[PDB]
């Protein structure tokens, strides 16, 4: 599902975090979607 083509600029991932109710999300250096920030 959540994929990181962009790192950090990956709003398509960030929106998932925001949809869940997270402060936000970001793709880290591992190209993994993380939600918290």
Swiss-Prot record:
Keyword tRNA processing: no
Gene Ontology biological-process entries: defense response to Gram-positive bacterium; humoral immune response
Disulfide bond positions: 4-27, 13-33, 17-35
Compartments reported by the entry: Secreted
GO molecular function, one term: toxin activity
Top-level taxon in the UniProt lineage: Eukaryota
GO cellular component: extracellular space
Keywords (A to Z) from UniProt: Disulfide bond, Ion channel impairing toxin, Neurotoxin, Potassium channel impairing toxin, Secreted, Signal, Toxin, Voltage-gated potassium channel impairing toxin
Tissue: Expressed by the venom gland.
Note: Is abundant in venom, since it accounts for 45.2% of precursor counts.
Physiological role: The recombinant peptide moderately increases Kv11.1/KCNH2/ERG1 currents and shifts the voltage-dependence of the channel activation to hyperpolarised potentials. In vivo, induces neurotoxic effects when injected into insects (tested on L.cuprina and A.domesticus).
Domain remarks: Has the structural arrangement of an alpha-helix connected to antiparallel beta-sheets by disulfide bonds (CS-alpha/beta).
Family, per entry: Belongs to the asilidin-12 family.
Name of this protein: U-Asilidin(12)-Dg3b
Residues of the full protein shown: 34 to 69 of 69
């Amino acid at each position: 599902g959540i994929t990181c083509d962009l790192i950090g600029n990956e709003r398509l991932c960030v929106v998932h975090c925001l949809a869940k109710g997270f402060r936000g999300g970001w793709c880290d250096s591992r190209k993994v979607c993380n939600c918290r920030r």
